Symmetry: D2
Subunit: 243 residues, 4 copies
């Protein structure tokens, strides 16, 4: 996360950390608990090539990474079949936990938006995670969870911006219809935040509007952070996750 | 270049090296001379974002990198407007030199194939460059120009292979129509060879069938090297390069 | 620390961590509390060249680095005037804190040995620190304080071993009189543990026999870890630290 | 080499490059041809621990490293028995070649100074090599041999300088009597130049006064380059090398 601060212990109870086997269970991507037994994340974090379930673990909300770990095994990885690269789209995936987690006020699910829900440009939303605090700058120990308020940006405006200072023809889509943008030159997501949540509070109730997907650098001019638009893939999600 | 060997001094007179400014003019991509004033290369080597021309230089056929340099400045960089990523396609671009080069048996242009040439499996083709000799393994000094004969594979077969061991739906095409596959687990192109030529001997003449574009790793099982299919972009090239 | 394991919460109340300013206050050397206002460490950790005091801070006993930091500033750095390199000797230094610390069962001083104590082979001794767990292998997060029991080895025996597989003349002493050896191919100190304490339980009390100083690699055959022999520098220490 | 330039092809015919087996025969230190079959170099380049001769090779004078290599096998490595570290002294060694070299005007031996020869403070001498051009700054391809004129510095003055800004007692020798210094904040030797020669033209002949040994940083204030004093070890040298 770029341009944000450490999150209060009572904030973002649905945030999760994905760990990969190694000298130690290292954090490589974020995710969100959308059901007691299901985690939502980005496809590029666990694909497109098939990965060994035994080398993956999920860690529920932690104030500091690695300090009070309680790793959970994953029983199944479901990557959207239309996914190959983030730039092409469908950057979304599901992780079925071995056991349904025991929800508490400190750790619980985030609510998904209704199919008709559309987050307007400028609406203040939040992105969270343990990723880099700037281009090539790793989050330093003790690795606190970070948060940053970012305003939603209209898909068309975002697409236009990405063409600025680029050779790509203005008529050639870069930011596609299943993607959403947010952030600016001071606040953005970054490597390591991928798969994590972008939440906006509507009628009270926090709704997850997107999944951290990709971008060109972090907080770079005319290069807003790009997310997978959750509403676009609700049918696919609800094909595996109980409503 | 993975596998293969050092190229004879008389071979590949059209090979060029792209250099980026810094502590020394370092090689970052390949290319080919297709006209005394024009170099053909890959779009991902110079795009999708517009970079400063001043920071780019071209080196014509050299037996070893850096030892006998005579760097040439560029006046224009033109990238296919459809380009954004190599996985999507249109990974091709042109560089116009500030002056026409003098040709000879040691340095001259490569011939482009006629629109109808398909380059089927069994066709004798070679790829050349100063790229890595293996995954994560750079070409060691004195940096000789390497070459390797690679077997052509039909797009449909190649696409099927890229789906093996991947979550991507079988009907979601990975190897696209404007692309071409070549190589195996012993012969392939690698990082650093990008933008370089894949040439095939047809009826006694060398024709550039492709431009080193991308691939998953180098010489990895079920993951042959991918090239931009030159015949697919002949009309675009001819808008800029005199015949 | 190579071998051994995570130290219990109640052990080594005198262990200290030296921090250098930068992206975060990073651990670079060990140390021990020998007086409410003084820390004993290795000269090579802070010398031979004079560095800015401001860029240094001390962290008293804590289970995991960076988690519960309470950094303490230093008013003075005193390095043995005979020091230039660890191999030559006199690798010992003192840090005076700006304020005396409050002691308790969880944080208190370690007892220095009587001038006559020799710490012969067979005596039970432990070395502690947050250093590498193996050659060029850092302690992974959450960075627990490690400990390991190491076997003492007589100086002359150690010296002979250091000559095995070396061009150095047998009569040219390598392990000097102001030094002490401990450890084997399974138990040893390593980079990052430097300045830390080697303590032995004598007549029911813990005495600091040495300070982690140097060695060829970590836990390498015929190359035991080398420590500064505390008894040799008691007079110097007592010139600054009161009883 | 710091602050110098490319050496003319006709100069320094006695310069050699030591290579170590690996992906390629990489340069790791310099040396000088002092006899048709003997190379003089620094002990720390090949010691203190014994290494097998099979992984070592010698390359005679070439304008650019790796370009037109003609590697020579070594029959024996002789390290001074009093050597353990550069800071202690005796940093000198001999490499006996498998065959005597056929000297030419382009490649021949350098002359060793008489036992009584004393190089006065201020005398203009030269140090040559393929080492870093600045701290942590490697020599860029094509790796030309570099040279730099450095003035001799009186031993006492050099020792005094090394104490400035250090904790070491003024009466404790840092630069010893078997060592020699030269260079300033603009011109100096650096990592990779070790084992190489420092030659001074006395009257009308080039004499090798020193062997690049060590220092604190390169071209750093009050930290001139330190070399092993050749006249100090003339007897040891002539014990193996025919006069
Ligand atoms: N702006 C931005 N946000 C990002 C998150 C993950 C990877 C690349 C990114 N670029
Ligand atoms: N086989 C192959 N060739 C490549 C060239 C550039 C990047 C990735 C590649 N994989
Ligand atoms: N064996 C050993 N132990 C060491 C501790 C610090 C630096 C080098 C070392 N080598
Ligand atoms: N000044 C200086 N010259 C050096 C040559 C080799 C290693 C360290 C050095 N420091």
């Amino acid at each position: 996360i770029v341009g944000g601060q450490e999150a209060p212990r009572s904030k973002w109870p649905w945030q999760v950390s994905l760990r990969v086997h190694g000298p130690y269970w290292m954090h490589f991507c974020g995710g969100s608990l959308i059901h007691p037994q299901w985690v939502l994340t980005a496809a590029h974090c666990v694909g497109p090539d098939v990965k060994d379930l035994a080398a993956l673990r999920v860690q529920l909300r932690e104030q500091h990474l690695y300090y009070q770990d309680q790793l959970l095994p994953v029983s199944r990885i479901i990557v959207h079949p239309q996914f190959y690269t983030a730039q092409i789209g469908a950057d979304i995936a599901l992780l079925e936990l071995e056991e349904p987690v025991k929800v508490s006020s400190h750790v619980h699910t985030v609510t998904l938006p209704p199919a008709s829900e559309t987050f307007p440009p400028g609406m203040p939303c939040w992105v969270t995670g343990w990723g880099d605090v700037d281009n090539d700058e790793r989050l330093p120990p003790p690795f606190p969870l970070k948060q940053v308020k970012v305003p939603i940006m209209e898909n068309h405006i975002c697409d236009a911006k990405y063409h600025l200072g680029a050779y790509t023809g203005d008529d050639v889509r870069i930011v596609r219809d299943d993607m959403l943008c947010a952030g600016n030159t001071r606040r953005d997501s970054c490597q390591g935040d991928s798969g994590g949540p972008l939440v906006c509070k509507v009628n009270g109730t926090w709704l997850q509007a997107g999944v951290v997907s990709w971008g060109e650098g972090c907080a770079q001019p005319n290069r807003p952070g790009i997310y997978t638009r959750v509403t676009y893939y609700l049918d696919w999600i609800h094909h595996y996750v109980p409503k």
